[PDB]
Design a protein around this ligand. Sequence first.
Ligand code: HEM
Length: 396
Amino acid sequence: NLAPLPPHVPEHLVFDFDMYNPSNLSAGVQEAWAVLQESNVPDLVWTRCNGGHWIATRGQLIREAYEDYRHFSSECPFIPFIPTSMPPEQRQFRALANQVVGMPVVDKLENRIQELACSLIESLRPQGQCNFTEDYAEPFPIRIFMLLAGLPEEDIPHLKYLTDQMTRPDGSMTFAEAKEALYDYLIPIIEQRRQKPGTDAISIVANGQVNGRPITSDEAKRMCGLLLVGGLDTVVNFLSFSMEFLAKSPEHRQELIERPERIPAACEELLRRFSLVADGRILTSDYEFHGVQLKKGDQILLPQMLSGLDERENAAPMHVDFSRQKVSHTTFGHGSHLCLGQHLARREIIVTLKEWLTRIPDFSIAPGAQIQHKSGIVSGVQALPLVWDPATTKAV
Ligand code: HEM
């Protein structure tokens, strides 16, 4: 499974990390990745796993490579949708996406998000147990997308099925099939709303402009597809990491119960500690980067997760401290592809925590349960069995 070391890569830089099955995974996925930040590991390493690729291990280099788009291209953004894989066009497509998921939209949507969170939590509250990942986290971001995009509730099971196939296929559909079925769904809606628009995200995208002309159907379906898939697994898994931590740390949980005003700052610290994305780039040319010779076409993993875990960026980085004066991270990325959904995601997180902690303040991991993580481009939580006494809860 280890690809022989290419002639340009010096042996002293080899560290055979497997981003899909890291050695230390039972200890927690962030901890498993943090092996890359041990003192005997260089700032930039080559792994022979997954075909062989570079890994930047420190926030300084991860940030720099994301800034240097001329050398570090998004044409191959994953080891091994618009605008993921691309500057003048990129800027225009992002401006358009900001029209639909920017702060003003999020601020308008906030109480609808709260109303949805409340309905979900209240459905679970009297049971005294749930698998948080399946029972709250999975249904939540897809419903928020339907709100954002003005799509009917009845379309959820099929749309959720298609997005599930793109990331966790059961085998019924190839990636290409699931993507094309998503496009089959979106195309007539985009066409309809181009001619008769509302104020929803699809209407706004369908009526956008690029290079002085109307957005095409192909461009619009790809933008809408990315806005859909981008906010699903990231939010599901991130909420799950946060809730796992809160279930296991009654002291931190109590801090947020007593001082709910600290929740937004707590969100940011959790985003740092339980960061979860690890994307990459491809070298456009031969390039010497921090004393290391990179070759045209080499792939480089630039884990967003690692920047905030770097003790050079944050002291005692594995400790959760809601009062940190400066929370440094790249959890939503850095540079020209910075997450478009970051404002919506923060609001979903904060609303979820606020509503959960006021309705179900006291909860624990089910006894005997060992929470399992998974690793990859979006790392996550396989399941989160929680238990609580319903008499300690507050009903609608
Ligand atoms: C905790 C939640 C989220 C996290 C951690 C996250 C993380 C990221 C990261 C790291 C990137 C940059 C990827 C790269 O440079 O290779 C990104 C891009 C993106 N995200 Fe998110 N994301 C989250 C939620 C969302 C949501 C809710 C949406 C949609 C509403 C969304 C839509 C997008 C889109 C469209 C891009 C591509 C931007 C571009 O290429 O210009 N994300 N996200």
